[PDB]
């Protein structure tokens, strides 16, 4: 639904949807209709099908063709400054692909809006929804849009005969967590029967290890998920199924 979505939001109002409590299938998306840049940080793209994540934030916007470069944690530029701030140690994957066929229209699509003015650089994942008239000049404007008083929102002008570097690229940023809460999104890996009292390799919700599993007489409270030892070694687990 997000990837096939027809109507995309403006970059300064980049749309964020949470994804959770669903089996995901990343390999079929990685098998790509020539996505311009499926580029991943903090995780190897082939393995994405194996990890379990707590939640997967997905952010969507449409930007220039060649400006995709700016979507990086340690990056600078107008987009990184006044539109979208990827935090350092970002753990996710950036997807971009050209949408010249759909988005760009003859004469220039003008409804796409990117900002160019703000007091300071955006915070990590900051949404400057407000459209107050910028005091661009040294003199206060207080509602003036004169020659030295400027408006903070600017249209793009997507026309098909623009530069290839200026064609409309749709961009979707997937931000993972890799925390240890109940990991409610995970790949299509099958379940398996359980066996006890034997040294077996195991994966419980991406929590992997090797050991012998025995029935335990611990009194977990209902909100508990697993146990840990005096020196931080996983000692007991709750079976998911």
């Amino acid at each position, epitope marked *: 639904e997000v990837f096939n979505a027809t109507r995309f939001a403006s970059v300064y109002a980049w749309n964020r949807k949470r994804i959770s409590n669903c089996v995901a299938d990343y390999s079929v998306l990685y098998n790509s209709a020539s996505f311009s840049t499926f580029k991943c940080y903090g995780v190897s793209p082939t393995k994405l099908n194996d990890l379990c994540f707590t939640n997967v934030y997905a952010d969507s916007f449409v930007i220039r063709g060649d400006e995709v470069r700016q979507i990086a944690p340690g990056q600078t530029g107008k987009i990184a400054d006044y539109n979208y701030k990827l935090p350092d140690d970002f753990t996710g994957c950036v997807i971009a692909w050209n949408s010249n066929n759909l988005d760009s229209k003859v004469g*220039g699509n003008y409804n796409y809006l990117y900002r160019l003015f703000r007091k300071s650089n955006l915070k990590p994942f900051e949404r400057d929804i407000s459209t107050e*008239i910028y005091q661009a000049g040294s003199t206060p404007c207080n509602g003036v*849009e004169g020659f030295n008083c400027y408006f903070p929102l600017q249209s793009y002008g997507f026309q098909p005969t623009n530069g290839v570097g200026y064609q409309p690229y749709r961009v979707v940023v997937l931000s993972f967590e890799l925390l240890h809460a109940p990991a409610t999104v995970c790949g299509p890996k099958k379940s398996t029967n359980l066996v006890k009292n034997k040294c077996v390799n195991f994966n419980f919700n991406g929590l992997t290890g090797t050991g012998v599993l025995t029935e335990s007489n611990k009194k977990f409270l209902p909100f508990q998920q697993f146990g840990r030892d005096i020196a931080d070694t996983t000692d007991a687990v709750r079976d998911p199924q």
Partner: antibody
Amino acid sequence: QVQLKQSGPGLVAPSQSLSITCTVSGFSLINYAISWVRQPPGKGLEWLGVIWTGGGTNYNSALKSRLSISKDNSKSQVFLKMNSLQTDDTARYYCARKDYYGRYYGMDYWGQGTSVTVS
Amino acid sequence: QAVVTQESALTTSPGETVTLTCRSSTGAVTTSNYANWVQEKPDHLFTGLIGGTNNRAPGVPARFSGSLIGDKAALTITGAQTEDEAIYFCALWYNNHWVFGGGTKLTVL
């Protein structure tokens, strides 16, 4: 191609109201502002008013507050309204494109012109 | 504090350059009040010649050359035999609104 269009019947009798519209292609109302100029027969051009790029209107101070101008961001249309005419108001009216963002801060393009006559 | 004027008279033989001056009510004009030059064809055709009190418009030939030559705003066109037969208006940005010049008739040879 960048182009300005403006259309309206024009023929008006005294003391009633007619409105004129300006329709634009090749640019967005977000990247530019629109100003209107008026050309009476044989006399110099005078500035009517301007619509700012992202909301907010301006009007000529001496020009009556009993009038309004309006625009369409999505379909790129602009409408000028005069609610009561008098025989001195007969003139040709022109819409124009103003780019205060651009290095060429002044008005870039102008409308193709409409005749407005009294009786 | 609102008078705008032009000589309304211009005639230049080809090969020699001429300056026409538009004078406001504030004495010497500064770039702070932006100056504009527009040209009127006898068919009610308008175009932009000079902007920003020093900047030529896009698409108008560089033979058109306008600066703050005098104390007040001015424009200079090198002599042309055919295409200079037109009217020229000077525009000044007061703090609140725009004022347009009277218009100057050029009749080459």
